[PDB]
């Protein structure tokens, strides 16, 4: 262990009577001293604790304002086909969101390590599929933040970013619906379409935001804090490496980024995709409802203005066209409501199945995602697994 620690520092940072025991204690003490010196050298030269803090802030979503701002900025971009995304443009958007959010207050050494990564852009891909945070690890810190650890951290970052992007898309849809309700108050027949869009978007936002919360806090933030605490408490360079690897593996598993949680990750990804589909459908419904409301308001305003000018408020042809437009809007409102309800029901089914898989997942963060997705027990009413998982195991260990 001593020679290994020395090599890490270099490359990364009674004898007459009982000969066997005379040097054993001395060998162990020298090993401990050399290993401690190696770990201190690795920390001082490679900023291992600083790299871990950067990973926590960016890849573990610890800088929650930064992740929020990134997702909000990406929402209008990430809905577009990824083939039109420029990695330079995505990095610029990330930097702009940082400057517009509390991420601007991060240290330049931390902020320089938080970046936007664009995956290989394919047609039809959304930004949620290609956006990730990354944390560059090198030198001695790369012994603790190994390529596997960095990949797991980036996986958790991307998963949280995708979930937050879908949540924010659905939140923008619902915000548009709610705001346009004020405009559509003069078009009450169109208000229901906006309300249905708001409901579907709210369900999708709830699902995506709960998945992101679980991943970023229960998995990512906790595992990052454990890594940082272990590194600060590390007695040797190998102990620091092992503790950081274990932390990263825990983050991957609980954020569903490990190899074993791949089925849970697929179910969560399908839930996020159904939430994004619901968000897009709700945004389209709300856009149509707001356009109809604006047309009705413009027609009413023109009628009032012509009446004030002493002209016949609407021509019989213009009045027939206005009545036809209002009729078409009202007939589309029940249709829009039905489409939004269908999208909401599909999203809710996908979310319920994801929550069931998460509650059956070994990862505790996935159980927290299931509990959050069914806070009002909607998914618990739809997914039996979220109800069963907490009740069944605790009674069995109580019988001994």
């Amino acid at each position: 262990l001593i020679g290994k620690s020395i090599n890490f520092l270099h490359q990364v940072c009674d004898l007459f009577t009982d000969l066997e025991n005379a040097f054993q204690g001395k060998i162990d003490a020298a090993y401990f001293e050399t290993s401690k010196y190696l770990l201190d050298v690795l920390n001082k030269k490679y900023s291992l604790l600083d790299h871990m803090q950067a990973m926590r802030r960016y890849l573990l979503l610890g800088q929650g304002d930064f992740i929020r701002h990134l997702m909000d900025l990406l929402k209008p971009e990430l809905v577009r086909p990824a083939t039109t995304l420029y990695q330079h443009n995505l990095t610029g958007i990330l930097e702009t969101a940082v400057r517009a959010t509390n991420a601007q207050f991060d240290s330049p050494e931390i902020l320089r390590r938080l970046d936007v990564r664009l995956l290989e852009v394919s047609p039809g891909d959304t930004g949620w599929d290609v956006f990730s945070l990354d944390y560059h690890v090198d030198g001695p810190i790369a012994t603790v933040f190994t390529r596997e650890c960095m990949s797991h951290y980036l996986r958790v970052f991307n998963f949280l970013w995708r979930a937050k992007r879908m949540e924010y898309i659905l939140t923008d849809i619902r915000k548009g619906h709610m705001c346009n309700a004020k405009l559509l108050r003069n078009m009450p027949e169109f208000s229901g379409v906006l309300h249905q869009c708001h409901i579907l978007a709210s369900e999708m936002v709830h699902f995506i935001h709960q998945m992101q919360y679980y991943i970023t806090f229960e998995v990512l933030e906790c595992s990052w804090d454990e890594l940082w605490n272990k590194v600060q408490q590390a007695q040797d360079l190998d102990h620091i490496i092992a503790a950081h690897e274990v932390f990263l593996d825990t983050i991957i598993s609980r954020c569903l980024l490990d190899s074993d949680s791949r089925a849970l990750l697929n179910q969560l990804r399908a839930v996020f995709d159904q939430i994004i589909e619901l968000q897009n459908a709700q945004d389209a419904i709300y856009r149509a409802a707001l356009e109809e409301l604006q047309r009705r308001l413009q027609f009413e305003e023109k009628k009032k203005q012509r009446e004030i000018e002493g002209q016949w408020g609407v021509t019989a042809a213009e009045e027939e066209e206005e009545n036809k437009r209002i009729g078409e809007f009202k007939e589309s409102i029940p249709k829009m409501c039905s489409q939004l309800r269908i999208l909401t029901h599909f999203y809710q089914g996908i979310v319920q199945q994801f929550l069931v898989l998460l509650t059956t997942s070994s990862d505790e963060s996935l159980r927290f995602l299931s509990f959050r997705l069914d806070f009002n027990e909607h998914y618990k009413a739809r997914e039996p697994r979220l109800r069963v998982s907490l009740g069944t195991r605790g009674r069995r260990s109580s019988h001994t």
């Binding site: 009740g391 069944t392 195991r393 605790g394 009674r395 109580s398 019988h399 001994t400």
Partner: protein, 330 residues
């Protein structure tokens, strides 16, 4: 010093011996609805959360070892378990082995025990044999408290029934007197178990643990403590335990009947319903009195033939006013 045997033992007293009455009150308040379900219908999450509420809610939160306190749901009710154990090498062994396990879904109230996590090297002293004895004591006190709570609920329900109908007050007098005999009985049994068995055996343990010369002396004193509490709580006599079990079952059935009648009267042939209720109360009173006289008779028998001087204390507590004395003579 390093394994804090006395601190762990004080934690065990706090939880397993129901020394923290406020803790048990809070726990039973939070958990009563969940524990009343069949063990299969109980959500273990709710029991763990009620335990945590009771831990955070009691003065045990100042106990550094409170996290070693666990909820344990026993696979068998305490009475069947003790009768099977006592039947070993007895003529009853075959009867218990051939006794079909009654299809009565074991309630959490009957399955509830504590467990206590002892780490090495302290796991040498607070072993599973000790923890199981602590679980037996806990479950016994919890069941006594359940019977007390039921008798008080029947009391409250009857006080409410007395408020809604002035005319029904005459019919309620007999149910009140039955409840009062059950309540005085339950409280005196709980008092014996808590202050003459569990408390004395714990004080003996702490004194003996203070006099221990080695870890084996501490283990010996703890085993002797547990065995003394087990002996003095009447847990080692299968006939007394079986009579006490029947008495508590009759008490619970009486309290459930009184609660149902009071709820019906509050929500509200009625003369027929009242005569049926009074007949049920008189049948419960007869059964309770018969089981109580059999208990007092058995305590007197063991006191005279087996020199179990402790059994005379049970009798004197049970018949402190001589209510059973004429009945015992009869």
């Amino acid at each position: 010093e390093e394994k804090e045997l006395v601190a762990h033992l004080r934690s065990i007293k706090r939880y397993f011996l129901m020394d923290q009455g406020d803790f048990f009150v809070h726990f039973m308040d939070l958990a009563e609805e969940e524990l009343r379900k069949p063990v299969e219908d109980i959500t273990p999450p709710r029991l763990e959360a009620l335990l945590e509420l009771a831990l955070r809610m009691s003065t045990a939160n100042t106990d550094p070892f409170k996290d070693d306190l666990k909820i344990d749901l026993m696979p068998h009710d305490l009475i069947t378990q003790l009768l099977r154990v006592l039947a070993i090498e007895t003529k009853q062994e075959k009867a218990m082995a051939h006794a079909d396990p009654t299809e009565l879904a074991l309630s959490g109230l009957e399955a509830f025990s504590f467990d206590y996590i002892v780490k090495w090297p302290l796991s040498l002293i607070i072993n599973r044999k000790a923890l199981t004895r602590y679980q037996m004591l806990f479950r016994h006190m919890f069941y006594c408290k359940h019977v007390e709570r039921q008798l008080c609920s029947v009391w409250i329900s009857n006080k409410t029934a007395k408020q809604h109908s002035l005319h029904s007050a005459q019919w309620f007098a007999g149910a009140f007197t039955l409840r009062q005999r059950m309540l005085n009985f339950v409280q005196n049994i709980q008092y014996y178990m808590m202050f003459e068995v569990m408390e004395p055996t714990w004080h003996i343990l702490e004194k003996n643990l203070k006099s221990a010369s080695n870890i084996d002396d501490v283990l010996g004193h703890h085993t002797g403590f547990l065995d003394t509490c087990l002996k003095d709580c009447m847990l080692t006599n299968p006939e007394l335990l079986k009579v006490f079990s029947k008495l508590m079952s009759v008490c619970v059935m009486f309290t459930n009947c009184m609660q149902k009648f009071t709820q019906s009267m509050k929500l509200d042939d009625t003369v027929q319903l009242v005569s049926g209720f009074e007949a049920t109360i008189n049948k419960f009173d007869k059964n309770f009195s018969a089981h109580l006289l059999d208990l007092l008779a058995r305590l007197s028998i063991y006191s005279t033939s087996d020199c179990e001087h402790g059994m005379a204390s049970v009798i004197s507590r049970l018949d402190f006013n001589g209510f059973y004395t004429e009945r015992l003579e009869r």
